[PDB]
Protein backbone atom coordinates (compact mmCIF):
# COMPACT_ATOMS: atom_id res chain seq x y z
CA UNK A 1 0.00 0.00 0.00
CA UNK A 2 2.79 2.44 0.92
CA UNK A 3 4.82 1.59 -2.21
CA UNK A 4 3.33 4.65 -3.94
CA UNK A 5 4.86 7.04 -1.37
CA UNK A 6 7.95 5.20 -0.10
CA UNK A 7 11.66 5.87 -0.62
CA UNK A 8 13.97 3.13 -1.94
CA UNK A 9 17.76 3.19 -2.14
CA UNK A 10 18.74 0.88 -5.01
CA UNK A 11 17.15 -1.97 -6.94
CA UNK A 12 18.29 -5.23 -8.50
CA UNK A 13 16.23 -6.42 -11.46
CA UNK A 14 16.48 -10.21 -11.66
CA UNK A 15 14.73 -11.94 -14.55
CA UNK A 16 14.21 -15.65 -15.19
CA UNK A 17 11.57 -18.18 -16.27
CA UNK A 18 10.06 -20.85 -14.02
CA UNK A 19 7.15 -23.29 -14.19
CA UNK A 20 3.60 -22.16 -13.54
CA UNK A 21 3.23 -24.26 -10.40
CA UNK A 22 6.54 -22.88 -9.09
CA UNK A 23 5.11 -19.35 -8.82
CA UNK A 24 2.92 -20.35 -5.86
CA UNK A 25 5.95 -22.10 -4.34
CA UNK A 26 7.47 -18.63 -3.82
CA UNK A 27 6.25 -17.97 -0.27
CA UNK A 28 7.82 -17.90 3.22
CA UNK A 29 7.07 -21.32 4.67
CA UNK A 30 6.09 -22.91 1.35
CA UNK A 31 8.32 -25.59 -0.15
CA UNK A 32 10.18 -25.41 -3.44
CA UNK A 33 13.51 -25.63 -5.23
CA UNK A 34 14.33 -22.16 -6.64
CA UNK A 35 15.52 -20.75 -3.30
CA UNK A 36 18.84 -22.64 -3.29
CA UNK A 37 20.29 -22.79 -6.82
CA UNK A 38 18.58 -20.38 -9.23
CA UNK A 39 17.64 -17.48 -6.94
CA UNK A 40 18.45 -16.89 -3.27
CA UNK A 41 15.37 -15.73 -1.34
CA UNK A 42 15.79 -14.88 2.36
CA UNK A 43 12.79 -15.10 4.67
CA UNK A 44 13.17 -11.31 5.05
CA UNK A 45 13.29 -10.74 1.29
CA UNK A 46 13.12 -6.95 0.87
CA UNK A 47 11.69 -6.67 -2.62
CA UNK A 48 8.79 -7.30 -4.96
CA UNK B 1 32.43 -39.41 -18.81
CA UNK B 2 30.11 -42.44 -18.64
CA UNK B 3 26.69 -42.98 -17.10
CA UNK B 4 25.87 -45.60 -14.50
CA UNK B 5 26.02 -46.18 -10.77
CA UNK B 6 26.95 -43.01 -8.83
CA UNK B 7 27.43 -41.26 -12.21
CA UNK B 8 24.27 -39.61 -13.56
CA UNK B 9 23.72 -36.96 -16.20
CA UNK B 10 24.68 -33.58 -14.67
CA UNK B 11 21.80 -31.54 -16.14
CA UNK B 12 18.03 -31.91 -15.81
CA UNK B 13 15.36 -30.43 -18.07
CA UNK B 14 12.20 -28.56 -17.12
CA UNK B 15 9.09 -30.51 -18.08
CA UNK B 16 7.55 -28.17 -20.66
CA UNK B 17 5.54 -30.31 -23.08
CA UNK B 18 2.31 -29.73 -25.03
CA UNK B 19 0.44 -32.27 -22.88
CA UNK B 20 1.23 -30.21 -19.75
CA UNK B 21 -1.74 -28.73 -17.92
CA UNK B 22 -2.52 -25.12 -17.09
CA UNK B 23 -0.38 -25.15 -13.94
CA UNK B 24 2.72 -26.29 -15.86
CA UNK B 25 2.92 -23.32 -18.24
CA UNK B 26 6.11 -21.20 -18.37
CA UNK B 27 5.86 -18.10 -16.17
CA UNK B 28 8.48 -15.41 -16.72
CA UNK B 29 9.42 -13.53 -13.56
CA UNK B 30 11.11 -10.15 -13.00
CA UNK B 31 12.03 -9.33 -9.40
CA UNK B 32 12.96 -5.88 -8.09
CA UNK B 33 14.93 -6.56 -4.90
CA UNK B 34 15.63 -3.42 -2.90
CA UNK B 35 18.93 -2.82 -1.10
CA UNK B 36 20.23 0.10 0.95
CA UNK B 37 23.64 1.74 0.62
CA UNK B 38 22.38 7.32 -2.29
CA UNK B 39 18.61 6.77 -2.54
CA UNK B 40 17.53 7.76 -6.06
CA UNK B 41 14.21 5.84 -5.98
CA UNK B 42 11.06 7.39 -4.52
CA UNK B 43 7.29 7.11 -4.93
CA UNK B 44 5.37 8.80 -7.74
CA UNK B 45 2.45 9.54 -5.39
Amino acid sequence: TKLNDLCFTNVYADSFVIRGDEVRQIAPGQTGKIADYNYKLPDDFTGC
Amino acid sequence: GVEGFNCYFPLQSYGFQPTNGVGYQPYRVVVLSFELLPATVCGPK
Partner: antibody, heavy 118, light 106 residues
Framework: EVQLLESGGGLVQPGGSLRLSCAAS????????MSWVRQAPGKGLEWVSV???????YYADSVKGRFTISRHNSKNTLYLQMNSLRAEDTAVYYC????????????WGQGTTVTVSS | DIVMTQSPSSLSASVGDRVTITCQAS??????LNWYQQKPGKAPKLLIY???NLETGVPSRFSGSGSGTDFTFTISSLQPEDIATYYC?????????FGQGTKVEI
Protein backbone atom coordinates in the same frame (compact mmCIF):
# COMPACT_ATOMS: atom_id res chain seq x y z
CA GLU C 1 34.04 -46.92 -0.16
CA VAL C 2 30.66 -45.19 -0.45
CA GLN C 3 28.16 -46.58 2.05
CA LEU C 4 25.12 -45.38 4.03
CA LEU C 5 24.67 -47.38 7.24
CA GLU C 6 21.70 -47.16 9.59
CA SER C 7 21.70 -46.86 13.38
CA GLY C 8 18.97 -46.53 15.99
CA GLY C 9 15.41 -47.73 16.33
CA GLY C 10 13.59 -49.75 18.96
CA LEU C 11 10.42 -49.88 21.07
CA VAL C 12 10.20 -46.30 22.33
CA GLN C 13 6.88 -45.22 23.82
CA PRO C 14 4.75 -42.39 22.40
CA GLY C 15 6.16 -39.09 23.58
CA GLY C 16 9.47 -40.84 24.26
CA SER C 17 12.80 -39.69 22.86
CA LEU C 18 14.70 -41.83 20.36
CA ARG C 19 17.65 -41.32 18.01
CA LEU C 20 17.78 -42.47 14.40
CA SER C 21 20.93 -41.85 12.40
CA CYS C 22 22.36 -42.44 8.93
CA ALA C 23 26.15 -42.53 8.62
CA ALA C 24 27.43 -41.81 5.12
CA SER C 25 30.82 -42.31 3.49
CA UNK C 26 31.83 -41.05 0.06
CA UNK C 27 29.39 -38.10 -0.03
CA UNK C 28 28.83 -34.81 1.82
CA UNK C 29 25.51 -34.50 3.64
CA UNK C 30 25.86 -30.75 4.29
CA UNK C 31 26.27 -29.74 0.63
CA UNK C 32 24.15 -32.43 -1.07
CA UNK C 33 20.62 -33.78 -1.00
CA MET C 34 19.77 -36.50 1.48
CA SER C 35 16.43 -37.61 2.87
CA TRP C 36 14.58 -39.72 5.40
CA VAL C 37 11.35 -41.53 4.50
CA ARG C 38 8.83 -43.78 6.28
CA GLN C 39 6.76 -46.72 5.05
CA ALA C 40 3.68 -47.61 7.08
CA PRO C 41 2.63 -51.27 7.43
CA GLY C 42 -0.09 -51.98 4.90
CA LYS C 43 0.44 -48.58 3.25
CA GLY C 44 2.69 -47.08 0.61
CA LEU C 45 5.77 -44.96 1.15
CA GLU C 46 5.56 -41.60 2.92
CA TRP C 47 8.06 -38.76 2.59
CA VAL C 48 9.46 -37.47 5.91
CA SER C 49 12.28 -34.94 5.56
CA VAL C 50 15.13 -33.68 3.39
CA UNK C 51 18.42 -31.88 3.92
CA UNK C 52 19.61 -29.66 1.07
CA UNK C 53 22.81 -27.79 0.19
CA UNK C 54 22.88 -24.32 1.71
CA UNK C 55 21.31 -24.65 5.14
CA UNK C 56 17.69 -25.06 4.05
CA UNK C 57 15.59 -27.55 6.02
CA TYR C 58 12.35 -29.02 4.66
CA TYR C 59 10.09 -31.50 6.46
CA ALA C 60 6.79 -33.28 5.86
CA ASP C 61 3.45 -32.20 7.31
CA SER C 62 3.45 -34.56 10.31
CA VAL C 63 7.14 -34.17 11.24
CA LYS C 64 7.39 -30.38 10.99
CA GLY C 65 8.15 -29.94 14.69
CA ARG C 66 8.37 -33.46 16.13
CA PHE C 67 11.78 -34.42 14.67
CA THR C 68 15.11 -32.63 15.11
CA ILE C 69 17.75 -32.92 12.38
CA SER C 70 21.47 -32.19 12.66
CA ARG C 71 24.33 -32.94 10.27
CA HIS C 72 28.08 -33.36 10.67
CA ASN C 73 30.87 -33.67 8.10
CA SER C 74 33.39 -35.00 10.65
CA LYS C 75 32.06 -38.53 10.03
CA ASN C 76 29.51 -37.58 7.32
CA THR C 77 26.54 -38.40 9.54
CA LEU C 78 22.95 -37.20 9.81
CA TYR C 79 21.08 -37.49 13.11
CA LEU C 80 17.36 -37.14 13.84
CA GLN C 81 16.28 -37.08 17.46
CA MET C 82 12.53 -37.72 17.71
CA ASN C 83 10.54 -36.64 20.77
CA SER C 84 6.81 -36.26 21.45
CA LEU C 85 6.13 -39.28 19.25
CA ARG C 86 2.76 -40.75 18.28
CA ALA C 87 1.48 -44.32 18.25
CA GLU C 88 0.98 -44.31 14.46
CA ASP C 89 4.72 -43.70 13.97
CA THR C 90 5.39 -47.47 13.96
CA ALA C 91 6.71 -48.03 10.43
CA VAL C 92 9.83 -48.99 8.49
CA TYR C 93 12.14 -46.00 8.02
CA TYR C 94 14.89 -45.52 5.42
CA CYS C 95 17.65 -42.99 4.86
CA UNK C 96 18.16 -42.35 1.16
CA UNK C 97 20.58 -40.43 -1.04
CA UNK C 98 17.90 -38.92 -3.24
CA UNK C 99 19.29 -37.32 -6.40
CA UNK C 100 16.43 -35.03 -7.50
CA UNK C 101 14.21 -36.31 -10.32
CA UNK C 102 15.82 -39.10 -12.36
CA UNK C 103 13.92 -42.02 -10.89
CA UNK C 104 13.00 -41.87 -7.22
CA UNK C 105 14.77 -44.15 -4.73
CA UNK C 106 16.84 -45.97 -7.34
CA UNK C 107 19.22 -47.28 -4.64
CA TRP C 108 17.94 -49.12 -1.56
CA GLY C 109 19.51 -50.42 1.62
CA GLN C 110 17.87 -52.42 4.42
CA GLY C 111 15.86 -49.93 6.49
CA THR C 112 14.96 -50.18 10.18
CA THR C 113 11.48 -50.44 11.66
CA VAL C 114 10.28 -48.38 14.63
CA THR C 115 7.51 -49.75 16.86
CA VAL C 116 5.81 -47.21 19.11
CA SER C 117 3.65 -49.74 20.95
CA SER C 118 2.95 -49.20 24.64
CA ASP D 1 -0.69 -31.20 -4.87
CA ILE D 2 -1.11 -34.21 -7.17
CA VAL D 3 -3.00 -37.26 -5.90
CA MET D 4 -3.59 -40.45 -7.88
CA THR D 5 -6.85 -42.41 -7.64
CA GLN D 6 -5.73 -45.82 -8.88
CA SER D 7 -8.75 -48.13 -9.02
CA PRO D 8 -7.03 -51.57 -8.77
CA SER D 9 -5.37 -52.51 -5.48
CA SER D 10 -5.22 -56.33 -5.47
CA LEU D 11 -5.94 -58.36 -8.62
CA SER D 12 -5.64 -62.15 -8.87
CA ALA D 13 -5.15 -64.03 -12.14
CA SER D 14 -3.94 -67.40 -13.42
CA VAL D 15 -0.49 -68.25 -14.76
CA GLY D 16 0.43 -66.75 -18.12
CA ASP D 17 -2.16 -63.96 -18.19
CA ARG D 18 -1.20 -60.46 -19.28
CA VAL D 19 -0.54 -57.78 -16.66
CA THR D 20 -1.95 -54.33 -17.44
CA ILE D 21 -1.58 -51.58 -14.83
CA THR D 22 -3.25 -48.18 -15.23
CA CYS D 23 -2.52 -45.30 -12.84
CA GLN D 24 -4.68 -42.19 -13.19
CA ALA D 25 -3.59 -38.86 -11.69
CA SER D 26 -5.58 -35.80 -10.67
CA UNK D 27 -3.27 -33.46 -12.62
CA UNK D 28 -1.01 -33.90 -15.64
CA UNK D 29 2.25 -35.75 -15.03
CA UNK D 30 4.80 -34.66 -17.65
CA UNK D 31 6.78 -37.80 -18.57
CA UNK D 32 7.58 -38.06 -14.85
CA LEU D 33 6.21 -41.37 -13.53
CA ASN D 34 8.06 -44.46 -12.32
CA TRP D 35 7.37 -48.19 -12.18
CA TYR D 36 8.99 -50.41 -9.54
CA GLN D 37 9.21 -54.08 -8.61
CA GLN D 38 8.96 -54.53 -4.85
CA LYS D 39 8.31 -58.31 -4.37
CA PRO D 40 6.54 -59.90 -1.37
CA GLY D 41 8.12 -58.31 1.70
CA LYS D 42 11.23 -57.11 -0.14
CA ALA D 43 12.40 -53.55 -0.66
CA PRO D 44 11.16 -51.77 -3.82
CA LYS D 45 13.40 -51.95 -6.89
CA LEU D 46 13.10 -49.21 -9.51
CA LEU D 47 12.69 -50.39 -13.11
CA ILE D 48 11.14 -47.60 -15.21
CA TYR D 49 12.09 -43.95 -14.73
CA UNK D 50 11.24 -40.76 -16.69
CA UNK D 51 8.35 -42.70 -18.32
CA UNK D 52 10.32 -43.51 -21.51
CA ASN D 53 13.85 -44.83 -20.79
CA LEU D 54 14.83 -48.34 -19.73
CA GLU D 55 17.39 -49.09 -17.03
CA THR D 56 20.15 -51.63 -17.59
CA GLY D 57 19.07 -54.82 -15.80
CA VAL D 58 15.29 -54.52 -16.16
CA PRO D 59 13.90 -57.60 -17.96
CA SER D 60 12.42 -57.14 -21.43
CA ARG D 61 9.07 -58.49 -20.18
CA PHE D 62 8.39 -55.17 -18.40
CA SER D 63 7.30 -52.04 -20.25
CA GLY D 64 6.20 -48.60 -19.11
CA SER D 65 4.71 -45.73 -21.07
CA GLY D 66 2.82 -42.49 -20.71
CA SER D 67 3.15 -38.72 -21.18
CA GLY D 68 0.38 -36.77 -19.49
CA THR D 69 -2.71 -37.87 -17.57
CA ASP D 70 -2.57 -41.50 -18.73
CA PHE D 71 0.15 -43.96 -17.70
CA THR D 72 0.41 -47.65 -18.58
CA PHE D 73 2.52 -50.59 -17.40
CA THR D 74 2.57 -53.80 -19.44
CA ILE D 75 3.85 -57.31 -18.71
CA SER D 76 3.34 -59.86 -21.50
CA SER D 77 5.24 -62.92 -20.19
CA LEU D 78 3.76 -63.71 -16.78
CA GLN D 79 6.19 -65.28 -14.31
CA PRO D 80 5.97 -66.22 -10.62
CA GLU D 81 8.71 -63.64 -9.99
CA ASP D 82 6.22 -60.94 -11.06
CA ILE D 83 4.00 -61.55 -8.00
CA ALA D 84 4.57 -58.16 -6.37
CA THR D 85 3.08 -54.69 -5.83
CA TYR D 86 3.72 -52.19 -8.62
CA TYR D 87 3.65 -48.53 -7.59
CA CYS D 88 3.18 -45.36 -9.63
CA UNK D 89 5.01 -42.32 -8.27
CA UNK D 90 4.87 -38.69 -9.38
CA UNK D 91 8.04 -36.69 -8.68
CA UNK D 92 6.39 -33.67 -10.28
CA UNK D 93 4.47 -31.47 -7.80
CA UNK D 94 5.88 -30.73 -4.35
CA UNK D 95 5.36 -32.45 -2.04
CA UNK D 96 6.25 -35.65 -3.93
CA UNK D 97 3.73 -38.01 -2.38
CA PHE D 98 4.10 -41.71 -3.18
CA GLY D 99 1.46 -43.99 -4.67
CA GLN D 100 -0.45 -46.91 -3.20
CA GLY D 101 0.41 -49.44 -5.92
CA THR D 102 -1.61 -52.35 -7.30
CA LYS D 103 -0.72 -55.81 -6.00
CA VAL D 104 -0.59 -58.63 -8.55
CA GLU D 105 -0.54 -62.18 -7.16
CA ILE D 106 -0.82 -65.31 -9.29
Amino acid sequence: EVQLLESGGGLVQPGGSLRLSCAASGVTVTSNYMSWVRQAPGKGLEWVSVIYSGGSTYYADSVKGRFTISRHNSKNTLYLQMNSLRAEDTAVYYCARDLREAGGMDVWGQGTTVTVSS
Amino acid sequence: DIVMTQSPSSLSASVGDRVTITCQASQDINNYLNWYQQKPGKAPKLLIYDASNLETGVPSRFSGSGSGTDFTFTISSLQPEDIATYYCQQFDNLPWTFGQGTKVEI
